[PDB]
Short mmCIF file of C-alpha atoms in Angstrom, two decimals:
data_model
loop_
_atom_site.label_atom_id
_atom_site.label_comp_id
_atom_site.label_asym_id
_atom_site.label_seq_id
_atom_site.Cartn_x
_atom_site.Cartn_y
_atom_site.Cartn_z
CA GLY A 30 90.65 111.26 122.35
CA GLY A 31 94.18 112.83 121.45
CA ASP A 32 96.36 115.69 120.52
CA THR A 33 95.41 116.42 117.19
CA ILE A 34 92.68 118.98 115.95
CA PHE A 35 90.35 115.96 115.77
CA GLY A 36 90.74 115.58 119.46
CA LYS A 37 89.69 119.10 120.25
CA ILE A 38 86.79 118.67 117.96
CA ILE A 39 85.76 115.24 120.08
CA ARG A 40 85.92 117.21 123.18
CA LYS A 41 84.15 119.98 121.62
CA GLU A 42 86.73 122.43 122.25
CA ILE A 43 86.43 123.76 118.74
CA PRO A 44 83.22 123.69 116.46
CA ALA A 45 82.55 121.20 113.74
CA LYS A 46 79.53 120.66 111.26
CA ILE A 47 78.67 117.69 113.32
CA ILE A 48 76.52 114.99 111.41
CA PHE A 49 76.33 112.08 113.88
CA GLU A 50 77.71 111.13 117.32
CA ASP A 51 77.54 107.95 119.38
CA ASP A 52 79.87 106.48 122.48
CA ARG A 53 82.56 105.55 120.09
CA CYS A 54 82.71 107.68 116.82
CA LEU A 55 81.65 111.12 115.46
CA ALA A 56 80.91 112.12 112.06
CA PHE A 57 81.33 115.86 110.80
CA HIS A 58 81.57 117.52 107.16
CA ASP A 59 85.30 118.02 105.97
CA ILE A 60 86.37 121.79 106.33
CA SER A 61 87.84 121.52 103.03
CA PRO A 62 85.42 119.42 100.94
CA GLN A 63 86.23 117.85 97.69
CA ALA A 64 83.09 116.93 96.67
CA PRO A 65 79.40 118.42 97.17
CA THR A 66 79.31 115.88 99.99
CA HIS A 67 82.51 115.13 101.78
CA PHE A 68 82.26 113.93 105.52
CA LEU A 69 84.52 112.15 107.92
CA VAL A 70 83.76 109.43 110.58
CA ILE A 71 86.38 109.06 113.41
CA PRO A 72 86.72 106.99 116.46
CA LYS A 73 86.79 108.99 119.80
CA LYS A 74 89.66 106.47 120.59
CA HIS A 75 92.99 107.87 119.52
CA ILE A 76 94.47 105.68 117.00
CA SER A 77 97.01 107.55 114.95
CA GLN A 78 97.00 105.69 111.97
CA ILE A 79 95.29 102.56 110.13
CA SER A 80 98.88 100.78 110.21
CA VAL A 81 98.81 100.71 114.06
CA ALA A 82 95.31 99.58 114.57
CA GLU A 83 95.22 96.67 116.84
CA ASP A 84 93.30 93.34 115.97
CA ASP A 85 91.03 94.23 118.81
CA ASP A 86 90.01 97.36 116.94
CA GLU A 87 88.31 95.48 114.08
CA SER A 88 84.70 95.72 114.75
CA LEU A 89 85.26 99.62 115.63
CA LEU A 90 86.65 100.03 112.14
CA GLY A 91 83.95 98.14 110.75
CA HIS A 92 81.56 100.41 112.62
CA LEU A 93 83.00 103.46 111.04
CA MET A 94 82.02 102.03 107.76
CA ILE A 95 78.63 101.18 108.97
CA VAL A 96 78.04 104.68 110.49
CA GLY A 97 79.35 106.19 107.34
CA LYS A 98 76.92 104.15 105.12
CA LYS A 99 73.99 105.21 107.35
CA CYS A 100 75.24 108.93 107.26
CA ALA A 101 75.55 108.73 103.26
CA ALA A 102 71.99 107.71 102.98
CA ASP A 103 70.65 110.37 105.39
CA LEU A 104 72.82 113.34 103.53
CA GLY A 105 70.97 112.03 100.34
CA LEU A 106 73.78 110.45 98.42
CA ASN A 107 71.46 107.96 96.54
CA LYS A 108 73.57 107.86 93.17
CA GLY A 109 76.83 106.58 94.97
CA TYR A 110 79.88 107.70 97.05
CA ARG A 111 83.44 106.51 97.88
CA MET A 112 85.16 105.75 101.11
CA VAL A 113 88.60 106.45 101.69
CA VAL A 114 91.41 105.78 104.41
CA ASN A 115 94.67 107.46 104.04
CA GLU A 116 97.93 106.09 105.68
CA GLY A 117 101.05 108.23 106.06
CA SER A 118 102.86 110.13 103.51
CA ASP A 119 102.36 108.40 99.95
CA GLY A 120 98.64 108.09 101.15
CA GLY A 121 98.43 111.68 101.87
CA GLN A 122 97.08 111.27 105.65
CA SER A 123 96.53 115.00 106.78
CA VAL A 124 95.96 114.22 110.54
CA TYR A 125 97.48 111.59 112.68
CA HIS A 126 94.07 110.28 114.10
CA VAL A 127 92.39 107.61 112.18
CA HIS A 128 89.30 108.87 109.98
CA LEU A 129 87.28 107.49 107.06
CA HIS A 130 86.43 109.98 104.29
CA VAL A 131 82.86 109.57 102.45
CA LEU A 132 82.78 111.54 99.36
CA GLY A 133 79.87 111.74 96.69
CA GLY A 134 77.20 113.92 95.03
CA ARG A 135 79.51 113.93 91.93
CA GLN A 136 81.19 111.28 89.57
CA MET A 137 84.29 110.26 91.39
CA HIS A 138 86.96 109.22 89.20
CA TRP A 139 89.52 106.59 88.62
CA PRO A 140 92.36 106.19 89.70
CA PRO A 141 91.42 107.35 93.28
CA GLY A 142 94.34 109.99 93.51
CA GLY B 2 80.28 83.97 97.05
CA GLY B 3 78.21 85.35 94.25
CA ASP B 4 76.98 85.94 90.74
CA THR B 5 80.23 88.02 89.93
CA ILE B 6 83.85 87.67 88.91
CA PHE B 7 84.73 88.01 92.50
CA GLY B 8 82.55 84.73 92.92
CA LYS B 9 84.76 83.10 90.30
CA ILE B 10 87.85 83.90 91.99
CA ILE B 11 86.19 82.80 95.44
CA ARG B 12 85.31 79.48 94.02
CA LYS B 13 88.84 79.25 92.67
CA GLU B 14 87.28 78.67 89.42
CA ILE B 15 89.50 81.44 88.02
CA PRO B 16 93.08 82.14 89.19
CA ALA B 17 94.24 85.16 90.89
CA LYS B 18 97.58 86.02 92.85
CA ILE B 19 96.44 85.37 96.21
CA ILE B 20 98.42 87.24 98.97
CA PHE B 21 96.21 86.02 101.81
CA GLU B 22 93.07 83.99 102.54
CA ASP B 23 91.16 82.83 105.47
CA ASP B 24 87.78 81.70 106.20
CA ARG B 25 86.33 85.30 105.68
CA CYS B 26 87.86 86.87 102.95
CA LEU B 27 90.43 86.79 100.30
CA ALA B 28 93.26 89.30 99.20
CA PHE B 29 94.86 89.35 95.69
CA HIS B 30 96.34 91.43 93.17
CA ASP B 31 94.44 93.62 91.10
CA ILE B 32 95.20 92.88 87.29
CA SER B 33 94.61 96.55 86.12
CA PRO B 34 96.76 98.36 88.79
CA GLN B 35 96.34 102.36 89.41
CA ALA B 36 99.65 102.05 91.40
CA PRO B 37 102.91 99.99 91.72
CA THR B 38 101.06 97.73 94.33
CA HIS B 39 97.43 97.62 93.99
CA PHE B 40 95.47 94.74 95.53
CA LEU B 41 91.91 93.82 96.66
CA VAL B 42 90.61 92.39 99.93
CA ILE B 43 86.98 90.93 99.52
CA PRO B 44 84.55 88.96 101.95
CA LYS B 45 83.72 85.64 100.72
CA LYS B 46 80.16 86.42 101.80
CA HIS B 47 78.46 87.87 98.89
CA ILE B 48 77.47 91.54 99.90
CA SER B 49 76.57 93.12 96.81
CA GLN B 50 77.58 96.69 97.81
CA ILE B 51 78.26 98.86 101.15
CA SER B 52 74.87 100.66 100.93
CA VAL B 53 73.25 97.34 101.82
CA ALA B 54 75.68 96.03 104.66
CA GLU B 55 73.76 94.58 107.47
CA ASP B 56 74.73 96.01 110.89
CA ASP B 57 76.06 92.30 111.71
CA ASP B 58 78.39 92.79 108.78
CA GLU B 59 80.55 95.44 110.57
CA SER B 60 83.13 92.91 112.04
CA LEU B 61 83.47 91.49 108.56
CA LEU B 62 83.90 94.99 107.39
CA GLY B 63 86.71 95.79 109.78
CA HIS B 64 88.48 92.63 109.19
CA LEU B 65 88.83 93.71 105.45
CA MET B 66 90.69 96.45 106.78
CA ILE B 67 92.74 94.83 109.26
CA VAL B 68 93.83 92.46 106.68
CA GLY B 69 94.55 95.18 104.25
CA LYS B 70 96.83 96.74 106.51
CA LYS B 71 98.62 93.73 107.47
CA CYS B 72 99.09 92.80 103.56
CA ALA B 73 100.00 96.37 103.02
CA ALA B 74 102.99 95.68 105.46
CA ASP B 75 104.06 92.40 104.13
CA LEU B 76 104.09 93.79 100.59
CA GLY B 77 106.29 96.40 101.97
CA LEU B 78 104.33 99.69 101.92
CA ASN B 79 106.09 101.57 104.52
CA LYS B 80 105.95 104.78 103.09
CA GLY B 81 102.00 104.68 103.30
CA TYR B 82 99.15 103.75 101.10
CA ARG B 83 95.36 104.59 100.54
CA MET B 84 92.27 102.23 101.17
CA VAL B 85 89.24 102.76 99.07
CA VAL B 86 85.78 101.45 98.72
CA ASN B 87 83.49 102.37 95.92
CA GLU B 88 79.58 102.50 96.16
CA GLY B 89 77.36 102.45 93.12
CA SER B 90 77.46 104.73 89.86
CA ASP B 91 78.85 107.78 91.29
CA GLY B 92 81.47 105.72 93.37
CA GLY B 93 82.72 104.00 90.22
CA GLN B 94 81.73 100.76 91.49
CA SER B 95 82.11 98.36 88.70
CA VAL B 96 81.66 94.68 90.18
CA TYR B 97 78.62 94.59 92.47
CA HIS B 98 80.41 92.50 95.17
CA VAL B 99 81.99 94.38 98.04
CA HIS B 100 85.68 94.97 97.82
CA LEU B 101 88.41 97.08 99.17
CA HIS B 102 91.15 98.34 97.16
CA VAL B 103 94.65 98.98 98.59
CA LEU B 104 96.96 101.40 96.76
CA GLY B 105 100.58 102.20 97.54
CA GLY B 106 104.20 102.70 96.22
CA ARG B 107 103.75 105.83 94.63
CA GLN B 108 102.29 109.40 96.02
CA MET B 109 98.68 109.43 96.13
CA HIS B 110 97.10 112.78 95.25
CA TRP B 111 94.05 114.60 96.31
CA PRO B 112 91.07 114.67 95.84
CA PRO B 113 91.01 110.89 95.66
CA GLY B 114 89.21 110.74 91.96
#
């Protein structure tokens, strides 16, 4: 889904350290990790940014969190983690294809950036 | 919903600057902001933390996000923003009632804590 490097990964055109996959999303380790465990859960549907997600995409967005929570458990993150969604410039969004970050394996700090 | 502070805000026992409310959630300003605009979206249903959300909770979860992106827009966060959900000790989760932070109004940095 899409014209970003994330679309290419979804189409298996380029490799990724794929963690989990179903009919509507894909989870894989972040190529530039900011913690001992740092992964991403993305919808196969190309939604460029969270700000343009439709009301109808509600449960799908919720599914990215459920999948993230499940993957977190199976990667051994028993002491906690942080989920992050970045939007546009001030938010530091690196790829215009909606993605949920999950970071753990270390004490995350405050503020969150 | 709950034995926490969020419980008191949901039961309207303690005041908060509400930005939006419906039958499923509440969105209000964080009293200790880490950015010019800093608010929380919480489900009225008491879910202690994300690690324990049920599969049936995914629609509710995506709703917190849909509501977050709408409020961010109403609050004028056109340059971007960052959404964060903290889980447990390593995640910095202070209050054990699920809540989504929305931060904006300034450049957010990387890593997010």
